[PDB]
């Protein structure tokens, strides 16, 4: 048997099909079994429409055997395109051996596995092309768009393997596919899922700036608007200031800015380096939470 | 030498260039030698225009040595995008070892080989991503479009390897490329070719329904039109009925419907499962042949 | 460690980031260290804008360690999309082991390496799909477009690995990436670079014809215009003549014509085969240099 063939076969039981249907519409995606109690991680875009209109939508999980089981939404994070589902009392569930995204290196061979019984399902092969690559992601519906610090791959990520796992050559999940190919790393996923499972919510830092990218001789995220009462207006950030370092992550554009704000601690003090009218200023800002009552 | 390099070299003699030229136009594609008598299988789109206008077009086969030999059309099937050519009295022809498409598994490494002396020829690599995947295919010219139950691959199928073979790691033809990558499986090809060689024609079942896809909570192929005298109008199929199983192949959309009708036996009785006004009806239809005089 | 992972790691020190910036703009690409004196080969499109407007642009080379060093343009060839840069007094430079593009075969596994510290950098994997494939290339700015006799690959060539090397499985540069994937072969690069280093210029043959492609029953490069005083008008080439062989390279279209003219010797006599009004004429032309004073 093939080396790639042995690995895809070893994980197909852990990959499931997610089907959300209404009276007149239906969406479909893939997901992965992470916990034996019945916890299934997928993307947020796949189920976005079951959550914004639950009175008319119903979500079911189809396993490798064709067994179709109703599912309930545990929690969802539109800012990491992640989501957790739960099926109840289902047994003999083959859980996925999750790996460490910190040991992944560029050039390692991977497999973007989709759900075996999915309609347009796909199993693609490639390598890890880049690590810690910010990527803009379009938010489905009322949801907000976001930027994620992702694992890039030349394996094709598409509608047939989105929400399924990025698998290494030891059959371990090192990322979650999102729909040249980008994946949400497993180390961020294990953290988002723990909070989504225990609380039904994940709280993320906010500063209150909108940014546009700039690249010349002076490069980073240029300020478009500072909100009133925002931690940024209190910290001294001004319109048309250029941010080049947030906390300790240097920032090359607006996309890396979004990623670096999420890496800050809420309510702790953070250095923010700015170039204003040709002078270097290092300000200090305390990040607010995006949902106070839930923090 | 490379593992992929050894395999592409072992099959290049069996892959040929097909050149169809008129006074002011010229098409080009790839093909494969399947029989030592000089039988060459290609796609139907490649030669479509030599067959609909033969008085002005001429088709020649260019071998690996640059030897250019006139060719004649044995038969063609627009519904499987397949076609057979014959060169006469050419000797020392290296025939392709044809494999079994039923032993192919997802994740097996493949090679989409094009014709060595072709203009924009390409040799691409990848894996088998999906099996038994219906795919719509655009029919060139007066020809009809069709849907084929195909082998999907992430190896790029394009103008430079269409009509050439999908090769496994034992240098065996497991499919015929058609122009993310789809291939006509060798087991369907061996059957279509046998009929095209012995009869110059292949007869396929027809029922007389036009279908549009639907996906909601009730999913399959919805009836748009039933022809008069069609086996479907006789079997009781009605407009706005939803087909979910044809024969014994469940049907998820209009594309799988087209594929499942071709799997029925002509003149034999076939169960057809339909959901009408929220009620489940199982009808019975006898498939007609698309060409009576030839059946 | 992975087999592809070991190879990309072994060459990352030789691959550098090239950054050209003005007051309001900035371009970025990749390059490769070919000589220990500090000679760096990239594409011409990457630096095109530092050369046409040098009073406002500044080019710097960023190494694997983040060490940022100013760079100077040695020479550039818009017709092979090649360019040479020089950094001065930098030591401990890890040079790339350059290979032989004449020993490369179709199906050999390759890696399209980009600059590690580049913004949108990518490391892609694939195989050599075709050899000696002419490809049109769009010239940036005032520069002219060209056609190059290239190494085609299914590894994705993009903004993140353009100018970086095409690497074989022995970690040797067999080509230079240019932005389904095409690369400038190392054997042409070693020649262009030697002239660009020693002279700051490369002189290429010209004949003075503009050509459009034609394919029918008679195929090659059709003449659109012959310039006055051009070696072609002196050699007898006429408008609406069809060129099928230049020197000893047969020509299938206008793109291979461009490639074959560059293979001729300047000031030497060359056979040019033409089909005119259905008759075969073999003319004789002496190629001029594109820059006389520099030849």
PDB file of C-alpha atoms in Angstrom, chain C residues 177-273:
ATOM      1  CA  UNK C 177      12.094  30.787 -10.585  1.00  0.00           C
ATOM      2  CA  UNK C 178      10.187  33.417 -12.561  1.00  0.00           C
ATOM      3  CA  UNK C 179       6.635  34.584 -11.909  1.00  0.00           C
ATOM      4  CA  UNK C 180       1.923  26.283 -14.418  1.00  0.00           C
ATOM      5  CA  UNK C 181       5.392  26.989 -13.010  1.00  0.00           C
ATOM      6  CA  UNK C 182       8.337  28.010 -15.173  1.00  0.00           C
ATOM      7  CA  UNK C 183      12.013  28.505 -14.359  1.00  0.00           C
ATOM      8  CA  UNK C 184      15.028  29.976 -16.161  1.00  0.00           C
ATOM      9  CA  UNK C 185      17.528  27.098 -16.533  1.00  0.00           C
ATOM     10  CA  UNK C 186      20.800  27.336 -14.642  1.00  0.00           C
ATOM     11  CA  UNK C 187      22.900  26.691 -17.742  1.00  0.00           C
ATOM     12  CA  UNK C 188      21.507  29.832 -19.453  1.00  0.00           C
ATOM     13  CA  UNK C 189      21.825  31.773 -16.161  1.00  0.00           C
ATOM     14  CA  UNK C 190      25.493  30.911 -15.681  1.00  0.00           C
ATOM     15  CA  UNK C 191      26.113  32.332 -19.166  1.00  0.00           C
ATOM     16  CA  UNK C 192      24.030  35.513 -18.833  1.00  0.00           C
ATOM     17  CA  UNK C 193      25.532  36.195 -15.406  1.00  0.00           C
ATOM     18  CA  UNK C 194      29.139  35.870 -16.610  1.00  0.00           C
ATOM     19  CA  UNK C 195      28.531  38.545 -19.250  1.00  0.00           C
ATOM     20  CA  UNK C 196      26.499  40.758 -16.908  1.00  0.00           C
ATOM     21  CA  UNK C 197      29.279  40.551 -14.308  1.00  0.00           C
ATOM     22  CA  UNK C 198      32.217  41.166 -16.648  1.00  0.00           C
ATOM     23  CA  UNK C 199      30.554  43.779 -18.885  1.00  0.00           C
ATOM     24  CA  UNK C 200      27.380  45.006 -17.208  1.00  0.00           C
ATOM     25  CA  UNK C 201      25.602  44.008 -20.418  1.00  0.00           C
ATOM     26  CA  UNK C 202      24.620  41.024 -22.558  1.00  0.00           C
ATOM     27  CA  UNK C 203      24.381  41.328 -26.348  1.00  0.00           C
ATOM     28  CA  UNK C 204      21.714  39.315 -28.150  1.00  0.00           C
ATOM     29  CA  UNK C 205      21.056  38.670 -31.851  1.00  0.00           C
ATOM     30  CA  UNK C 206      18.356  40.489 -33.768  1.00  0.00           C
ATOM     31  CA  UNK C 207      16.931  39.925 -37.236  1.00  0.00           C
ATOM     32  CA  UNK C 208      14.178  42.537 -37.466  1.00  0.00           C
ATOM     33  CA  UNK C 209      10.971  40.544 -37.973  1.00  0.00           C
ATOM     34  CA  UNK C 210       7.717  40.636 -36.032  1.00  0.00           C
ATOM     35  CA  UNK C 211       5.849  37.332 -36.080  1.00  0.00           C
ATOM     36  CA  UNK C 212       2.374  35.938 -35.461  1.00  0.00           C
ATOM     37  CA  UNK C 213       1.681  32.241 -34.962  1.00  0.00           C
ATOM     38  CA  UNK C 214      -0.165  30.047 -37.461  1.00  0.00           C
ATOM     39  CA  UNK C 215      -1.263  26.406 -37.353  1.00  0.00           C
ATOM     40  CA  UNK C 216      -2.851  24.638 -40.325  1.00  0.00           C
ATOM     41  CA  UNK C 217      -1.962  22.224 -43.150  1.00  0.00           C
ATOM     42  CA  UNK C 218       1.079  23.600 -44.986  1.00  0.00           C
ATOM     43  CA  UNK C 219       2.755  25.616 -39.361  1.00  0.00           C
ATOM     44  CA  UNK C 220       5.066  28.113 -37.682  1.00  0.00           C
ATOM     45  CA  UNK C 221       5.746  31.844 -37.300  1.00  0.00           C
ATOM     46  CA  UNK C 222       4.100  34.107 -39.882  1.00  0.00           C
ATOM     47  CA  UNK C 223       5.780  37.409 -40.747  1.00  0.00           C
ATOM     48  CA  UNK C 224       3.874  40.566 -39.801  1.00  0.00           C
ATOM     49  CA  UNK C 225       6.533  43.227 -40.434  1.00  0.00           C
ATOM     50  CA  UNK C 226      10.093  43.366 -41.754  1.00  0.00           C
ATOM     51  CA  UNK C 227      11.971  46.495 -40.717  1.00  0.00           C
ATOM     52  CA  UNK C 228      13.972  48.608 -43.151  1.00  0.00           C
ATOM     53  CA  UNK C 229      17.683  47.847 -42.995  1.00  0.00           C
ATOM     54  CA  UNK C 230      16.916  44.786 -40.877  1.00  0.00           C
ATOM     55  CA  UNK C 231      19.041  41.691 -41.651  1.00  0.00           C
ATOM     56  CA  UNK C 232      15.752  40.039 -42.600  1.00  0.00           C
ATOM     57  CA  UNK C 233      14.880  42.517 -45.356  1.00  0.00           C
ATOM     58  CA  UNK C 234      18.419  42.050 -46.678  1.00  0.00           C
ATOM     59  CA  UNK C 235      18.129  38.255 -46.468  1.00  0.00           C
ATOM     60  CA  UNK C 236      14.975  38.242 -48.590  1.00  0.00           C
ATOM     61  CA  UNK C 237      12.331  37.627 -45.922  1.00  0.00           C
ATOM     62  CA  UNK C 238       9.011  39.094 -47.029  1.00  0.00           C
ATOM     63  CA  UNK C 239       5.684  39.927 -45.417  1.00  0.00           C
ATOM     64  CA  UNK C 240       3.270  36.991 -44.961  1.00  0.00           C
ATOM     65  CA  UNK C 241       6.087  34.440 -45.205  1.00  0.00           C
ATOM     66  CA  UNK C 242       5.913  31.480 -42.809  1.00  0.00           C
ATOM     67  CA  UNK C 243       9.083  30.539 -40.916  1.00  0.00           C
ATOM     68  CA  UNK C 244       9.426  26.892 -39.908  1.00  0.00           C
ATOM     69  CA  UNK C 245      13.165  26.502 -39.147  1.00  0.00           C
ATOM     70  CA  UNK C 246      15.626  29.082 -37.800  1.00  0.00           C
ATOM     71  CA  UNK C 247      19.256  28.023 -37.824  1.00  0.00           C
ATOM     72  CA  UNK C 248      18.847  24.397 -36.806  1.00  0.00           C
ATOM     73  CA  UNK C 249      15.917  24.824 -34.368  1.00  0.00           C
ATOM     74  CA  UNK C 250      12.543  23.987 -35.950  1.00  0.00           C
ATOM     75  CA  UNK C 251       9.918  26.580 -35.017  1.00  0.00           C
ATOM     76  CA  UNK C 252       6.289  25.713 -34.224  1.00  0.00           C
ATOM     77  CA  UNK C 253       5.027  29.217 -33.356  1.00  0.00           C
ATOM     78  CA  UNK C 254       6.086  32.812 -32.740  1.00  0.00           C
ATOM     79  CA  UNK C 255       7.274  32.009 -29.209  1.00  0.00           C
ATOM     80  CA  UNK C 256       9.788  29.384 -30.340  1.00  0.00           C
ATOM     81  CA  UNK C 257      10.886  31.804 -33.073  1.00  0.00           C
ATOM     82  CA  UNK C 258      11.947  34.367 -30.453  1.00  0.00           C
ATOM     83  CA  UNK C 259      13.872  31.652 -28.604  1.00  0.00           C
ATOM     84  CA  UNK C 260      15.595  30.354 -31.748  1.00  0.00           C
ATOM     85  CA  UNK C 261      16.842  33.779 -32.885  1.00  0.00           C
ATOM     86  CA  UNK C 262      18.660  34.196 -29.563  1.00  0.00           C
ATOM     87  CA  UNK C 263      20.458  30.885 -30.213  1.00  0.00           C
ATOM     88  CA  UNK C 264      22.075  32.195 -33.411  1.00  0.00           C
ATOM     89  CA  UNK C 265      25.597  33.599 -33.565  1.00  0.00           C
ATOM     90  CA  UNK C 266      25.928  37.311 -34.295  1.00  0.00           C
ATOM     91  CA  UNK C 267      27.507  38.187 -37.634  1.00  0.00           C
ATOM     92  CA  UNK C 268      27.577  34.545 -38.774  1.00  0.00           C
ATOM     93  CA  UNK C 269      25.392  33.180 -41.555  1.00  0.00           C
ATOM     94  CA  UNK C 270      22.231  31.257 -40.693  1.00  0.00           C
ATOM     95  CA  UNK C 271      19.738  29.212 -42.749  1.00  0.00           C
ATOM     96  CA  UNK C 272      16.101  30.286 -42.409  1.00  0.00           C
ATOM     97  CA  UNK C 273      13.451  27.997 -43.906  1.00  0.00           C
TER      98      UNK C 273
END
